[PDB]
């Protein structure tokens, strides 16, 4: 729940006004949407699995942001099964259409932020060696793809963003100016094709000052 709040905020900022579903692991699945606060059980969540009957999920109301309410539902772990089309339908109290989506659990994976980020100055030319670890307690270690962000200290810093190939947890960065503080952070997501989803939150930043050439 404390980490679920931080994860929902990342997805809401990316794509508001739409039903968002995410899974930390294949077993679970949470769907939410941010709607403006109404003073007036207003909606009914319906989901259907493959070769299974239509069922209804418990809707939870929680206020968030500024004058907004976030309705979220957590599907049962037993009903969740990956690699299967899951038809979702949110219906209003009167019977009005609110949301209608068909998603696959394996395609909406939202991993946790990586940990153990360590930056080191390489003696060759003055480059930086980054080493990080996968998110804690996460299966399918060999299928995680990463992405590092090299931010410049002074002013607007977003000079470099390197995509790391799946399976390796370290990289050697190049082309950095001396006497400049570079701040590094690494992303994480499940690599295609069997798995899909969204980028995870950035790891704890690690800053390092580069010597003069």
């Amino acid at each position: 729940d404390p980490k679920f709040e931080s994860k929902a905020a990342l997805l809401a900022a990316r794509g508001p006004e739409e039903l968002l579903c995410f899974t930390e692991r294949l077993e679970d699945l949470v769907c939410f949407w941010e709607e403006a606060a109404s003073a007036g059980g207003q909606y009914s969540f319906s989901y259907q699995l493959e070769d299974e009957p239509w069922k209804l999920c418990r809707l939870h109301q929680a206020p968030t942001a500024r004058g907004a309410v976030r309705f979220w539902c957590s599907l049962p772990t037993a009903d969740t099964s990956s690699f299967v089309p899951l038809e979702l339908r949110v219906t209003a109290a009167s019977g009005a259409p609110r949301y209608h989506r068909v998603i696959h659990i394996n395609e909406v994976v939202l991993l946790d932020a990586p940990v153990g980020l360590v930056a080191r100055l390489a003696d060759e030319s003055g480059h930086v060696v980054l080493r990080w670890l996968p998110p804690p307690e996460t299966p399918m270690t060999s299928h995680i793809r990463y992405e590092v962000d090299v931010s410049a200290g002074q002013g607007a810093g977003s000079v470099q963003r390197v995509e790391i190939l799946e399976g390796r947890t370290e990289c050697v960065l190049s082309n950095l100016r001396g006497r400049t503080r570079y701040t590094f952070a690494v992303r994480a997501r499940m690599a295609e094709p069997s798995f899909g989803g969204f980028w995870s939150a950035w790891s704890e930043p690690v800053s390092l000052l580069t010597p003069s050439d």
Partner: protein
């Protein structure tokens, strides 16, 4: 102090060192933390010289540890025939049981040591022993798949139709694993080919579920019921199309399986094959005479998953293109929602209703504009989609495209006669949400098309 020094040495197998401890004054039957005597550790590592000197100098041959395992159990599990014969000669309990209830014959049959099996049976082991699960050593031998152990047990007097707690027979374990060599032997000695477990499954059910065509033909030659029904109501044809074993599906159908058999949920093999996505099986089921339009709506789930080849075959055999589900939604709705251009083109060419609405009132064009499938919105309007249709919220396809923010589709909707002046149940227009959300790009096109 001295007792713990013996079990530590017996585990490391220092034969010369152990003999020194046994004569100095170390307890031969010292209790471990798990209550395992030094005779246990010697029988596990297989040190025949240490095992003999322990029994000859007095040791607990029928010792029981915290798990119930005896020294004869360890020797039978590992497969030390030299140690097994020594234990039995020194008065070992040939029919001892642990917490699981496994006898030395149970473990030897599961691991598959035929020499140890024959020695225990010749010493006086009960061939029909049953553990806590209720299975005989023939069950453990059939689950692992050891032919020679099965032939030996059946020759000594094994129960071919033994039933455990779950109701399974040795033929069930062999048909579920996939060993035809022992299936024929079990049937030769006399096995019930149509045995029923607690779940109602027959050996033909478990065989067609795993995909052992060789076993399925042998079971049918011995008189298997091709249309057996379990607790879930599924025939072996259900399990075959559920997993997609074309060879078994064709054999069961020729033998006379019911292609229209209904289970407890309400699904024939076609609803399972089309959902799982087996173009090969779906074509065969329809040739023999599957009901293409039955309760379950297979065209819905097929167009939802994206099996374009299956959706084509279903319609070519006479599926209802405008079928209705629980929500009164046509398969054209799901196809336009999932964003499958080819399936949408196939459904519309076969006669799909382009203006069909569900209980909420959403048309396929409503769903296509909300998601943003430009290609599908183009095709729908070419077949006569209502550009000004409204749902229970009073929203037109232009209302939804503006709220989600799709500029290209709003361009197509206006080309087909979208009404910007339309109001919903709240009173807002297509131009109103553009300012409420904050998109000046959408307001640029709406303000020019509203007046002229």
């Amino acid at each position: 102090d001295l007792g713990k020094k013996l079990l530590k040495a017996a585990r490391a197998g220092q034969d010369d060192e152990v003999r020194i401890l046994m004569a100095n004054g170390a307890d031969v039957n010292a209790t471990d933390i798990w209550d395992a005597t030094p005779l246990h550790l010697a029988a596990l590592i297989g040190h025949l010289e240490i095992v003999e000197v322990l029994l000859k100098n007095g040791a607990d041959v029928n010792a029981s540890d915290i798990t119930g395992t005896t020294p004869l159990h360890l020797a039978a599990t590992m497969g030390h025939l030299e140690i097994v014969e020594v234990l039995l000669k020194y008065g070992a309990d040939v029919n001892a049981y642990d917490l699981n209830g496994a006898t030395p014959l149970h473990l030897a049959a599961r691991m598959g040591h035929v020499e140890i099996v024959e020695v225990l049976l010749k010493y006086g082991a009960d061939v029909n022993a049953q553990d806590a699960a209720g299975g005989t050593p023939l069950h453990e031998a059939a689950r692992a798949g050891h032919l020679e152990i099965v032939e030996v047990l059946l020759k000594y007097g094994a129960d071919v139709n033994a039933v455990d707690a779950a109701g399974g027979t040795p033929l069930h374990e062999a048909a579920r694993a996939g060993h035809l060599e022992i299936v024929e032997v079990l049937l030769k000695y006399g096995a019930d080919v149509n045995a029923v477990d607690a779940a109602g499954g027959t050996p033909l059910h478990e065989a067609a579920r795993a995909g052992h065509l060789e076993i399925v033909e042998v079971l049918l030659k011995y008189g298997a019921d091709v249309n057996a029904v379990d607790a879930a109501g599924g025939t072996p044809l259900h399990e075959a199309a559920r997993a997609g074993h074309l060879e078994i599906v064709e054999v069961l159908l020729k033998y006379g399986a019911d292609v229209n058999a209904v289970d407890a949920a309400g699904g024939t093999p076609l609803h399972e094959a089309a959902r799982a996505g087996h173009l090969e099986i779906v074509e065969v089921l329809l040739k023999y005479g599957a009901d293409v339009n039955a309760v379950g709506t297979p065209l819905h789930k097929a167009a939802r998953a994206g099996h374009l080849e299956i959706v084509e075959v279903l319609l070519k055999y006479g599926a209802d293109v405008n079928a209705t589900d629980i929500w009164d939604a046509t398969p054209l709705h799901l196809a336009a929602l999932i964003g499958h251009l080819e399936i949408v083109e196939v459904l519309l060419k076969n006669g799909a209703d382009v203006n069909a609405s569900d209980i909420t009132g959403t048309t396929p064009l409503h769903l296509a504009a909300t998601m943003g499938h430009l290609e599908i919105v183009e095709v729908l309007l070419k077949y006569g989609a209502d550009v000004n249709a409204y749902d229970l919220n009073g929203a037109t396809p232009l209302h939804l495209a503006a709220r989600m923010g799709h500029v290209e589709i709003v361009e197509v909707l206006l080309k087909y006669g979208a009404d910007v002046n339309a109001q919903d149940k709240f009173g807002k227009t297509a131009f109103d949400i553009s300012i409420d959300n904050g998109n000046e790009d959408l307001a640029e096109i709406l303000q020019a098309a509203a007046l002229e």
